[PDB]
Paper text:
Methylene‐tetrahydropterin reductases catalyze the reduction of a methylene to a methyl group bound to a reduced pterin as C1 carrier in various one‐carbon (C1) metabolisms. F420‐dependent methylene‐tetrahydromethanopterin (methylene‐H4MPT) reductase (Mer) and the flavin‐independent methylene‐tetrahydrofolate (methylene‐H4F) reductase (Mfr) use a ternary complex mechanism for the direct transfer of a hydride from F420H2 and NAD(P)H to the respective methylene group, whereas FAD‐dependent methylene‐H4F reductase (MTHFR) uses FAD as prosthetic group and a ping–pong mechanism to catalyze the reduction of methylene‐H4F. Mutational analysis of four functional amino acids, which are similarly positioned in the three reductase structures, indicated despite the insignificant sequence identity, a common catalytic mechanism with a 5‐iminium cation of methylene‐tetrahydropterin as intermediate protonated by a shared glutamate.
Glu6 at the C‐terminal end of β1 points towards the deaza‐isoalloxazine and pterin rings. Position A contains a glutamate residue in all three reductases. As the methylene group in methylene‐H4F and methylene‐H4MPT is chemically a rather unreactive aminal, it is unlikely that a hydride can be directly transferred. Therefore, the formation of a positively charged 5‐iminium cation is crucial for catalysis.
Author numbering:
A (entry chain A), B (entry chain A): 1 to 331
Amino acid sequence: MKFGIQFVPNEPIQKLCYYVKLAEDNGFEYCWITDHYNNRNVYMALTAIAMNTNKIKLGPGVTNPYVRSPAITASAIATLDELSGGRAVLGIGPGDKATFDALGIEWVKPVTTLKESIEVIRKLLAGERVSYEGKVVKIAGAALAVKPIQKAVPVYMGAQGPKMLETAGMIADGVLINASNPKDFEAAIPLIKKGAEAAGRSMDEIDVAAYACMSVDKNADKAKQAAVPVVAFIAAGSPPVVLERHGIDMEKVEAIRNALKSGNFPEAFKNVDDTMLEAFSIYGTPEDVVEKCKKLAEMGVTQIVAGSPIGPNKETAIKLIGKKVIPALKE
Amino acid sequence: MKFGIQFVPNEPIQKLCYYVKLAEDNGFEYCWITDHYNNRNVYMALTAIAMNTNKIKLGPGVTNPYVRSPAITASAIATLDELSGGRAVLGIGPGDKATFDALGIEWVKPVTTLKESIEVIRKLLAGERVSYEGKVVKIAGAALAVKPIQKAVPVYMGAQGPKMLETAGMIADGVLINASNPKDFEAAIPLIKKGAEAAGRSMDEIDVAAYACMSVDKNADKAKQAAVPVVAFIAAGSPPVVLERHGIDMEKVEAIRNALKSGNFPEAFKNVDDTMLEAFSIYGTPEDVVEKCKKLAEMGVTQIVAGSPIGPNKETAIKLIGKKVIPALKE
């Protein structure tokens, strides 16, 4: 099994570089840095990370077609791939409406735009002069001078709905699924397979990645507590098909949703229960986490991304995962 | 007088970092890195440059409102300012039509968009939750988490026309003028002053910067030759008011324009003459260059940006400028 790690670049980039280099030392193979306008720029963060790392794969996790021209994304990826000696991955997803309303960006046809942007980025990265007259992306003779080192930089697609999952199956080298429980991938993976089948692609060409909320501790209950704030948000933003799939107490969810609107948090955090924790996080001892990763592996997950909080102390957790989780999951 | 240096990031970023650190060692105070989708990403280049430098000011030279959301630009600048210990400048201009047709980007109202984007970036950098309902830029509750170190990161506006010059006078901390000859600034500076006056601003608040084609050599004629390719492009793209202002042989210009369309270059380069060289470059011995810089200083230029080619050998020229040009122009 492959392990990724995901960071929001919301701290001094030096601290981020320490965490990633630590992750690299601990056998993490993918480094995913989120891309939101209000934090440190994802590509500058990834530049510093590249300089402090040597082998971990690294890229935006995820960027989107809208906040920069896909052509800019292409050459940012090319640049990253040059600096890192060929370790770049492109995680790219739809973005979100609450970002694009804030930025005055029209959220046009997200499936179509993501598909067309991935195709344009790929062609640009391949060195082509691109003429692409899509429904949304319209490129007329663009060409990169900067070249990646990889022949084909991997493109990971953020995918939640069925059309996105199928599209990821047809076009993407990996699928980034914000989900921590096997039930989600039991539903998700056949959709990826339909898209793969539609393109004649084997599933072994496709890295199904769990963008999981993870919290590992030598003490299971402290792992629990660090998971609680993050599960509260995940549970609030989960679509009802995901709540229903997991039998989530729907009354607790709306009290959490309410208290989040109310800007107060301990009450929202008080209503996360053991069921939502099981559905939206991988928490507990390294033993707890290892069994849970195996259940995801058995469901077809090939990359598990340790997302926030990682653990009560991120440094302590990265070390624990490297010592006692990743070695327990070597094919 | 202040000296800047401008680089296209079209080489391995390590080489760029050497040049900038060399420039810094040689007393250059500003480092301007161009922002075009087809080269190395400007902000990743500036991240590495920051890590290899300590005191030179550095920023995009220039970015634009269109290839990334102004909000992304704001946090890229904030990020740069954090990494560099407060040395960021934002050079921002309109972009160009031949880039945005290639990218399918509508080149909407460039003066208005540049003005509104500068205002939004400033407010974002200041830490505000921004609601900005402009004619073009429409921001609704955006806010940065990343903070600059500078209280007010300097915004330099690329400006060529009279409306841009006046707008730069009203709003910008510097004006980036792609021009090498005093006649251009004799025309340009009163326009900046009109805008400054319209805002109650003194000219001593405004860094009038010559984005010059510079070529310095111990041998004047070799400096000449290295200037010839770059002047050929500048002369082809110059507006007729600039050709007319300089009495440029208009027949030579169209042969250069023709041969550039024809994709062949020695014939285009053969038709650069001593008049276009004088109008669109600062070339020659360090003595030649120093007198020419003084004539620009006397016209109101407060920053001279050594643009390509810098000299026949960029490393040799940066050293010559630091040894024999910059010290000869210390107020």
